[PDB]
């Protein structure tokens, strides 16, 4: 079949499956090929999820409690993965900026206060502020 081939190849080239899960999907395809569109679907669902587990797992600016709270939330509901990941990254930046703007060596306290205030006012420029801070810290380096 032509659906069989596209599903076979797609399942074969999903990056975030272990070997056993991939081989199980594929063996289910061999068993009843008429279930291709189902098998592929959940396989993609299983990929999109596990990828997520990795990314939040490797968000350096969150502690274990926050990370595995996001992981558990991802398990209790897989379908909102796209949301749970996004909001997690937005936390990461937010908590990173705060820390870096505090623990960064070469800023004077006027700049530091200004950054902490602009950060408390609007965290949506967290990534910007942090960036703007790092550059500043490097431009004023010894």
Q: How many helices (H) and strands (E) does the chain have?
A: 7, 0
Stated in angstroms to one decimal place, the resolution of this structure is 2.7
Structure tokens at 62: 């969150």
Structure tokens at 68: 């595995």
Calpha distance 11→1 (Å, rounded): 15
SS (H, E, C) 62-119: CCHHHHHHHHHHHHHCCCCHHHHHHHHHHHHHHHHHHHHHHHCCCCCHHHHHHHHHHH
Calpha distance 121→64 (Å, rounded): 27
């Amino acid at each position: 079949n032509k659906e069989q081939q596209n599903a076979f190849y797609e399942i074969l080239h999903l990056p975030n499956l272990n070997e056993e899960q991939r081989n199980a999907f594929i063996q289910s395809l061999k068993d009843d090929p008429s279930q291709s569109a189902n098998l592929l679907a959940e396989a993609k669902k299983l990929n999109e999820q596990q990828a997520a587990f990795y990314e939040i797992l490797s968000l350096p600016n969150l502690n274990e409690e926050q990370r595995n709270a996001f992981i558990q939330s991802l398990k209790d509901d897989p379908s909102q993965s796209a949301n749970l990941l996004a909001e997690a990254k937005k936390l990461n930046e937010q908590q990173a900026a705060f820390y870096e703007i505090l623990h960064l060596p070469n800023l004077n306290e006027e700049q530091r206060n200004a950054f902490i205030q602009s950060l408390k006012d609007d965290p949506s420029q967290s990534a910007n502020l942090l960036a703007e801070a790092k550059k500043l810290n490097d431009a004023q380096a010894p």
